[PDB]
Amino acid sequence: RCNTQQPGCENVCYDKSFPISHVRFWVLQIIFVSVPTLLYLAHVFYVMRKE
Amino acid sequence: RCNTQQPGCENVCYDKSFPISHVRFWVLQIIFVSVPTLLYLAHVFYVMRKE
Ligand SMILES: CC(C)CCC[C@@H](C)[C@H]1CC[C@H]2[C@@H]3CC=C4C[C@@H](OC(=O)CCC(=O)O)CC[C@]4(C)[C@H]3CC[C@]12C
Numbered sequence: 816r817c818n819t820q821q822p823g824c825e826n827v828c829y830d831k832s833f834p835i836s837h838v839r840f841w842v843l844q845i846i847f848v849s850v851p852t853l854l855y856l857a858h859v860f861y862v863m864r865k866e
Numbered sequence: 867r868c869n870t871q872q873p874g875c876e877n878v879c880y881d882k883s884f885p886i887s888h889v890r891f892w893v894l895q896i897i898f899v900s901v902p903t904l905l906y907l908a909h910v911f912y913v914m915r916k917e
């Protein structure tokens with residue numbers, strides 16, 4: 816909430832204050848941190864099949 | 867009118883903008899300008915009665 820009667824001020828002020836939410840930032844962080852292990856697991860699986 | 871949700875801001879802002887209204891200022895001005903002639907008329911009336 817904001818103290819004003821001007822329509823649209825709340826939207827822009829919220830956007831400026833929070834360009835991106837913390838939760839989604841952390842979701843992206845964990846996904847990026849986790850993907851390399853998945854890649855390594857897939858590579859090891861295929862290598863084991865070939866061997 | 868003012869653009870805000872704060873209660874009491876309109877009262878103080880109006881008071882600051884207009885410490886005194888123009889109409890009442892002009893009423894005071896004309897009364898002050900006119901009183902001396904009334905005083906002179908009364909003085910002349912009493913002097914004429916005495917004479
Ligand atoms: C926690 C770990 C120790 C066990 C749980 C994960 C594994 C079971 C993962 C590691 C790599 C995965 C594989 C990596 C890639 C593929 C993608 C996908 O490949 C396809 O068939 C693509 C579809 C197509 O061929 O058109 C099917 C699942 C599979 C075999 C995955 C099956 C599950 C695997 C073996």
Ligand SMILES: CC(C)CCC[C@@H](C)[C@H]1CC[C@H]2[C@@H]3CC=C4C[C@@H](OC(=O)CCC(=O)O)CC[C@]4(C)[C@H]3CC[C@]12C
Nearest residue numbers: 901902903904905906907908909910911912913914915
């Ligand atoms: C525009 C001009 C030319 C004419 C119109 C005004 C006059 C009629 C004025 C000028 C001075 C005035 C006088 C000035 C003072 C007094 C106050 C007052 O005096 C009292 O009797 C006070 C009461 C008391 O004695 O206890 C009565 C009206 C009177 C005589 C006024 C009556 C009307 C007068 C004569």
Ligand SMILES: CCCCCCCCCCCCCC
Nearest residue numbers: 847850851852854855856858
């Ligand atoms: C979004 C991707 C970021 C870069 C990830 C780098 C992963 C490196 C390990 C890949 C191992 C698989 C080799 C075949």
Ligand SMILES: CCCCCCCCCCCCCC
Nearest residue numbers: 898901902903905906907909
């Ligand atoms: C509020 C009063 C302001 C001063 C007025 C001055 C008037 C002068 C004339 C008086 C004449 C009567 C003499 C008896």
